[PDB]
Amino acid sequence: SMSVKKPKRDDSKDLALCSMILTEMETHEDAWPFLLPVNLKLVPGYKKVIKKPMDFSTIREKLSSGQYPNLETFALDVRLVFDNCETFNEDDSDIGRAGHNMRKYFEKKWTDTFK
Ligand SMILES: CC(=O)N1CCN(c2ccc(O)cc2)CC1
């Protein structure tokens, strides 16, 4: 509260560390469904069903231009990629399995880097 500060966690390297994690996810062999925005004109259902599309290239642009206020907003967008993937794809499909694999991959890098 006013004039009562909790001790300050060091956040000076967050930007660099999120960029590294993003690079590792970009180069994972199962990243291909998530590298670019889904083509809303060519994929039936997607525009109407998925209220907030997100993909790795859009995350990269936002990180490179100061559009994440902090750590957690970056993590919310990464998770959104995988939450959208589960909404639109069967668990037993290549894309569905790619999604589950990439989420598991991210969450371990996230824990090891920050927790
Ligand atoms: C990431 C994701 O959920 N998808 C769903 C469907 N997909 C697709 C693309 C082209 C096409 O002709 C038919 C399906 C794009 C990726």
Torsion of CA 23, 76, 79, 81, to 10 degrees: -80
* Run of H or E including 64: helix 56-64
Q: Is the distance from the beta carbon of residue 85 to the nearest atom of ligand 1 less than 6 Å?
A: yes
Question: Which experimental approach was used here?
Answer: X-ray
In angstroms, what is the span from residue 13 Cα to ligand 1's centroid? Answer: 35
What's the CATH code of the domain at 69? 1.20.920.10
The total number of structural domains in the chain stands at 1
Could you tell me the sign of the dihedral formed by the alpha carbons of 68, 28, 47, 92, in that order?
negative
- Name residue, tokens 């642009």: 61
31/24 Cα distance (integer angstroms): 10
Q: Resolution in A, one decimal? A: 1.9
Kindly calculate the radius of gyration of the chain based on its CA atoms and give it in whole angstroms.
16
82/59 Cα distance (integer angstroms): 13
Structural domain for 60, as ranges:
1-115
The CA-atom distances, in angstroms, between 61 and each of 19, 51, 57, 109 are: 11, 20, 6, 21
Q: Is the distance from the beta carbon of residue 22 to the nearest atom of ligand 1 less than 6 Å?
A: no
Could you tell me the sign of the dihedral formed by the alpha carbons of 6, 1, 75, 61, in that order?
negative
